[PDB]
Amino acid sequence: MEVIELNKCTSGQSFEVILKPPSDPSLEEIQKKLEAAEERRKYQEAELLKHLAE
Amino acid sequence: MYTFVVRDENSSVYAEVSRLLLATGQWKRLRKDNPRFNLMLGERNRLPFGRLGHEPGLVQLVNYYRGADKLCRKASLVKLIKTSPELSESCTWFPESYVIYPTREVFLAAYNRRREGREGNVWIALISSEASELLDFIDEQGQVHVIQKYLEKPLLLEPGHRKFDIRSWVLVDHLYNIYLYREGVLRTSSEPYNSANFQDKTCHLTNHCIQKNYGRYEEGNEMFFEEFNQYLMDALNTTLENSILLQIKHIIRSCLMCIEPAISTKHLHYQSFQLFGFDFMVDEELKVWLIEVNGAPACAQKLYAELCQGIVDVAISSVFPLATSIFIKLHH
Amino acid sequence: REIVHIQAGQCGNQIGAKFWEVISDEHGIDPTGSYHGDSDLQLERINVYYNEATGNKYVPRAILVDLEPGTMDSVRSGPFGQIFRPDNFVFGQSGAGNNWAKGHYTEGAELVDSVLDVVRKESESCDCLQGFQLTHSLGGGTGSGMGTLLISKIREEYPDRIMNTFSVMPSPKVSDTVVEPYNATLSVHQLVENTDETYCIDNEALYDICFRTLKLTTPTYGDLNHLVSATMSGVTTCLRFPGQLNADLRKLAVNMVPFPRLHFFMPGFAPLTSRGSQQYRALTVPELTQQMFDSKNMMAACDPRHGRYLTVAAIFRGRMSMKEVDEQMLNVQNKNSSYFVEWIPNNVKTAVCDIPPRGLKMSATFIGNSTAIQELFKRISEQFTAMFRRKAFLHWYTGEGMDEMEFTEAESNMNDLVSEYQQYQDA
Amino acid sequence: MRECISIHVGQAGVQIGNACWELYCLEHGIQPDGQMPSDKTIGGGDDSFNTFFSETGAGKHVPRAVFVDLEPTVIDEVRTGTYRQLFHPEQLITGKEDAANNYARGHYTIGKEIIDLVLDRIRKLADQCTGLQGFLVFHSFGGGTGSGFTSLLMERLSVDYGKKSKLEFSIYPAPQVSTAVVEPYNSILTTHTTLEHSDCAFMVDNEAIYDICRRNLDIERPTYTNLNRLISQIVSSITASLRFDGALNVDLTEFQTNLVPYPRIHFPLATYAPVISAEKAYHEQLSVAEITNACFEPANQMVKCDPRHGKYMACCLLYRGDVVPKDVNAAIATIKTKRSIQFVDWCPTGFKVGINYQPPTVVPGGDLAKVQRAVCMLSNTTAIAEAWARLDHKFDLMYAKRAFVHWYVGEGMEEGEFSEAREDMAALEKDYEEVGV
Ligand SMILES: Nc1nc2c(ncn2[C@@H]2O[C@H](COP(=O)(O)OP(=O)(O)OP(=O)(O)O)[C@@H](O)[C@H]2O)c(=O)[nH]1
Ligand SMILES: Nc1ncnc2c1ncn2[C@@H]1O[C@H](COP(=O)(O)OP(=O)(O)CP(=O)(O)O)[C@@H](O)[C@H]1O
């Protein structure tokens, strides 16, 4: 059971212990998606204001 | 009124368990995918253990032990016995076993040691005498197989010169008590045993099914415990308890005590019990051997009533109570 | 989050007035508009329903609408009459004659813009308007026909605000006229399209509850409206008082309404109490739970065992163990888990408020979205076609512009709604 | 010295942030006014607590915190609470209308209207940072703000700070404290859209915290104050290495290194012992070995699962209190024999350990007793995928009827983002299952 890289200091100490070894989208792309949804909203709202107008 | 669901319709055993539960008037059965169950009589493969014990205000109990397959899977059972110090290679009740995949690990080095004394070199998967005969049989299936020392000198019942195995039904409860059913079954071969023609594997393979002579000396190729013990007394001057049952109780205890840390539901959010069928092989020296552990075991027709009524008393009503014993507690 | 309240017609204004009486008592406001209460919980969310006047007075955010002056003069006379803002009495004179067409198309049309003006004034005051709640019956003519005209127009001006109604369903056991199934089917068509949440207050239930359970031999509208104030106070507790939930109309709609047309809720109350006579044993939390889920306590005459609960909201009032409330609520589901859809996990939510209602130490209001509400629409649809297959009494409507076709459409949209409720009672 | 900016989002995030920053203040001896008598470097310092506090010319110590809720109720109590003086008003951002438990309302509708305002106030702190490390982001899986605004924020931060690290503290939804029936939709939607923008995520299942509060704190019905104060103890354990002298987990980059080998699998299970009631009059102090053994009881995990049926990829032990290395290795020794600790073949079976001698700090009057030593294990075990499977099942149950879908489509979203976010989770569950058999 091998201890290693033990660092000490006034606050405490740390170390590691082995038991065994081995064996992003663009701002503009965000702006697109985010603005497609707002359009999809405004369509659905206009269809409602069109139905109410009928 | 407790609630339970049923997700393995192929369970001869718990088919009964469901029926008995309803007939108590205090157990209603929900639908498969209804999560507000107290008790899951679950499915055999891919039972969803990750989803259990998350229903607030529901104590949940399932009839299987996650991890239990490490014992009930032939390849894994060998791996378990070789590697656990609790069992060790110096395991005196498991026959020699190697796991060989189809595309010899240290299997060949043992077979050769057998060329040194020309000792018995019969094995199984399926039974051969030449390694090449067998090894060429696992690659014709393509799946992992396991080969074992065949027990060339077994114990034969007379009249018949016949083979047989012993199935003990063990029930482990939510507390990890180990309960052995007092009723056992000898699954007997009606064909007189002989070691010249292995390929005529009807007197070698003792499976109740594979015996599609069925019914000669005892009904259904099954001899219960009262009969066998009688014959033992008369024929060998011994009892079932002493010559055989001790070692079985030793093997059951040892196997289940091994995996207890991996499968115990003591401090877990859901709980498990499970019924196992343990399969043994008695040789001519009255020595018991462990063949296979069966995690999804069927009971013998005559004992269903009693065994399933005991699952409910010991494993189910223990957790969910309502308004001498048929088990032997294996102590630890 | 301000709410704007609207009461329309005979029924709408009589239950409207009780509501303001009942909750004005709970918030410690008196008829003069002055607060005289003990706790501060009473004032924390007082703005949801009341505008704060100078002199630190509290004026309900309520618009009063009728086509006749009758009831509206009544309200101004009643105990809390003076609390209501006088410019918010908006009325005509000709009445509506229990005629959906007169309310929606002829008589109501004249007056509606005047109503929309008061609405707009109140909306402008509002820091963040949640939406509107309306009280009306579906069987008369003002609250029914004009009521749904207002809703159609309000949705045009405020298409993204929440529309909540308390809609009293007609019943032969308590009916003014034979044409109520006509007026209700035309209204339900409107409600299915233009409201987020409607509480189906069935006059059939209020009658049976008054007759059978409260043993009232000859129930008046005042006995029925008692039951309606109690429910209305319950289903708005979580809006008027601080909680762990901080609930509002939109969140309520999100969580109650899996599908948009299935927004008709079964209300329930426990304990059922008759006016005046007070009984003296508080209920055990186990009793509140069994009673509130009892069909005998439902305010929509539907058997909950004939359908499945899509979602449930329950609200407990008084000093009691939330631990026990938890156990009792979990208890009823796991016991009757059959009657709750499996395909909406954890569809029963619960809330608690320390303050009980006047004259009870412990109470439970219940909001169910059960697929059994179809039983209600089926009832009204049967009555409707009993008459329509003979075009009986239709002249009252054709005479005001309406076409047989409009009747066939409404009927058909309703029978559709029943089909939709049946789709999921099986799923 | 490198700075760390904490961003708390929605109700769960903001209330937990109060919890934590109060604790941080007791632990660092900062007062409700932001004064820290111990700081002699007045108006500055590149001390290690300055990773979480800037100092003012007047000697005030100010959280590198920003709070963001789409609705004023919750942050308003921060604005009028014991630690008002602590924060700069610009740090407390408030909407007027909340996401109504709606992932898509908080992401698309109301999100798009506040994302730029928030990022500017975030940039106002990044401009006081000599070498900014990155972000600690606190939020619920369940709320509409919690889930939907957080992922819009996470996306942008990847764009405006592509070189800084992003860590997550995420409240996973539990019906005993839940506030909404659609929380499984919001959970999946936000995990799919945030997965590639978070380097390391610590899930805390409200179910687990609730049961610890009942079993070990003898609290009948835990409140958010009960849950959050216990939750910030764990958070403190996990961050103390950034705020204290040490050699283990000194920067947000070390958390990925030590705990996350494969990028997607970045959900380290947290286990924490001991939780001891402040009411218990006579308590027997637990040993290094008793508490280290407690780290392998599920009943102590932040997520209830079974690490036995799973494989480890990494593992840290964070001790606070009277602990020396020898007692740890002795405890480790005897634990490695009695427990089912299986590592993936391609990872050294081992334990990176860190000890801080200052024992755990408990807020005066809370529910936690003071203790001589405590520990928080961080293990990246595949058993945590159990939590993914549970959520994904509830999601499948509802979505197969498309129940509630319309609330989302009605805000701009497309029925298709539902099957896209869910297919991703299908991937995640599969990555975990390969890695662990
Ligand atoms: N542990 C803990 N969990 C919380 C807390 N507050 C809320 N939650 C959880 O967060 C989930 C809902 O997310 P919220 O943060 O409340 O919603 P939100 O972020 O304010 O977004 P909105 O929908 O706009 O309100 C619920 O399931 C709660 O269990 C808290 O203070 N502590
Ligand atoms: N090492 C050995 N020596 C001799 N005979 C053996 C043996 N191992 C097994 N046998 C016999 O041969 C049979 C081999 O088949 P096997 O044991 O795989 O069937 P099975 O036990 O899996 C059916 P079940 O699952 O229903 O119990 C054993 O049942 C036993 O009868």
Ligand SMILES: Nc1nc2c(ncn2[C@@H]2O[C@H](COP(=O)(O)OP(=O)(O)O)[C@@H](O)[C@H]2O)c(=O)[nH]1
């Ligand atoms: N519960 C209850 N129902 C009422 C009340 N007043 C009227 N109704 C019902 O409402 C229907 C009549 O509609 P009404 O509101 O009076 O006509 P309107 O004035 O034109 O809106 C009848 O079916 C009544 O049963 C009341 O005070 N309480």
Ligand SMILES: CNc1nc(N2CCCc3cc(OC)ccc32)c2cc(F)ccc2n1
């Ligand atoms: C404003 N009225 C209101 N709203 C509630 N909410 C909003 C917030 C989450 C929520 C989730 C639901 O899942 C089914 C149901 C209901 C609710 C509510 C909840 C109650 F348990 C009791 C009374 C309630 N009353």
Ligand SMILES: [Ca+2]
């Ligand atoms: Ca300094």
Ligand SMILES: [Mg+2]
């Ligand atoms: Mg009338």
Ligand SMILES: [Mg+2]
């Ligand atoms: Mg909020």
